[PDB]
């Protein structure tokens, strides 16, 4: 608290010009992100305490019991206390309970920003794999003609109605 | 022989209707569970309020209870409205698909199936429908050498329905999408222009009876 | 978030919320549903096939300078310079990131989006429509223009006599559309208005955080300080109900725009299926005039379909029998 109004969040040293009798550098969101020290001519950037946002990545109950947990938007570059196996620092946030491999695999369970996880005898994480990559050669005369001609069937599902009701 | 064992394998197929069914179910569960709620009321039962308290200052709880119930049912009916709109749009698309894929052979690629569409068959479902699209897919291929222009007697000729194919052993013309090695005959090619304006020009002979 | 939006660090407000209960959970399931549905639209608007290709190294493509659509190797974000200029024309992150305005990071990067666009462009340019139906079957490029001309009922000899002029006209058209996208900002408007519309939606949201519901202050902690909880709760319930209905209206506006952009994304995916993977005969659906080609280009939350079409220029009337 400083001179009436209060706030909550971490405090850093500001680096911007302030006027005489300038005390609040409030932005278009009207948040006191910058304040003047009431003792010396010292300037403070105010950035609020970081929230979490917690998600759990786990296969089926019949499958296994090993889990992993993501706290999105957490710059571990911490606040984890009881750590698990390994820590990773996705652009989405801070992830524990899994490890990252140097290869890319199928995105069966997406984590985000190209990161996807799965289960090996362990829970693994990786970058998203685009698929099977091949380039067909092109020439001034190169052409391809199919030889065998097979028949496939596709099944699609489309809704029609819901439960009509009155109250 | 696939599709039956394809449909009984996973519940992901009918899940596209199961989610709608259980979502309506849980919506009704939320509406029937919001009767026991606190809209600023001392108790969530109306006649208990009317019994334990005198009328002329009990309505200051009854009115806020009423407003809470009205807000709940208004949110419910608006969510029903938007679901009805999107399911009506999807059902109109389904009716169009039945009008095109089932009643004919549309040229809309990857719309009446996957690949070159041949057949479509509908099957009903509780508040739903499924389509069986019988399509053609090529299996495997082989590479060949291409030359558009065949100049016989100094005269350019282009194959009409298909292209020239160079087996190396022999040289034929086939159809556009598949192979039918066919000899050069006048009905397969049209004749136009000189022989000094084209790329892929080649020299070959032609048949006449 | 339910609580820290509608409350501060005052658990009595959360207690009154638990008296009311479960209304924010409907908003949570709605926002998660529309988010994953937007992700579904994104993954089935671009990832048509999992068989990813790449371009051949040499460009003998009949004098067709495809450098503007080809992914530039100098830029680390190896995309077309068209898309680079589109990103440059497109114009608020960290300040909103720590106020309960929790933006979800996109599960699909722009790098893989550009990779898919490059792969489908390469597949179209080396195989025509053959990869669209089944396996990729490469074809000569003049064969592709010949079959495109036969698609609109035009014989191929005229193509094989003025393909040089066709190439020059196409290169001039590419240069002029490069200038045209840099000419006016009206082409960027259909995405810029959406972006700033979401921005002003969140802006009036954070303004209605500082909205007075008949109390002394918008903040509740000073109200809890100056008055006992026997007194302040008759204001607190009014403020939390107002914030709740404001959230409900905001979520409603979110979902109706989500449905509109869902229909737009369905139409865009349909046009990708039809105009890009083949030659549709639907007039003006694949662009005005007789459609020949169509290439897509990525954009933040969007895609620009460029269409190469036939128009007739010189004509003459004649006696008809």
Author numbering:
A (entry chain B): 538 to 614, 629 to 671, 686 to 732
B (entry chain B): 928 to 1136
C (entry chain C): 733 to 823, 845 to 1074
Which statements did the authors publish about this structure?
Furthermore, multiple independent XBB lineages with both F456L and L455F are growing rapidly in different countries, such as XBB.1.5.70/GK.* in Brazil, the United States, and Canada, and HK.3 (EG.5.1.1.3) in China. To elucidate the disparities in binding affinity between XBB.1.5, XBB.1.5+F456L, and XBB.1.5+L455F+F456L (“FLip”) spike proteins with ACE2, we determined the structures of these three spike proteins individually in complex with hACE2 to interrogate the conformational change on their RBD-ACE2 binding interface. As we expected, all three spike trimers mainly showed two ‘RBD-open’ and one ‘RBD-closed’ conformations with one or two ACE2 bound. Consistent with DMS results, L455F significantly dampens hACE2-binding affinity of XBB.1.5 RBD, and F456L also slightly weakens the binding to hACE2. Surprisingly, although neither of the two mutations increases hACE2 affinity alone, their combination XBB.1.5+L455F+F456L exhibits significantly higher affinity than XBB.1.5. In contrast, “FLip” not only rescues the accelerated dissociation, but also facilitates association, synergistically improving the receptor binding at both thermodynamic and kinetic levels. Our structural analyses reveal that “FLip” mediates substantial conformation change on the RBD-hACE2 binding interface, which involves the remodeling of not only 455/456, but also Q493 on RBD and H34 on hACE2. Above all, the flip of L455 and F456 lead to synergistic effect of residues around and reorganize the interface between “FLip” RBD and ACE2 so that enhanced binding affinity can be obtained.
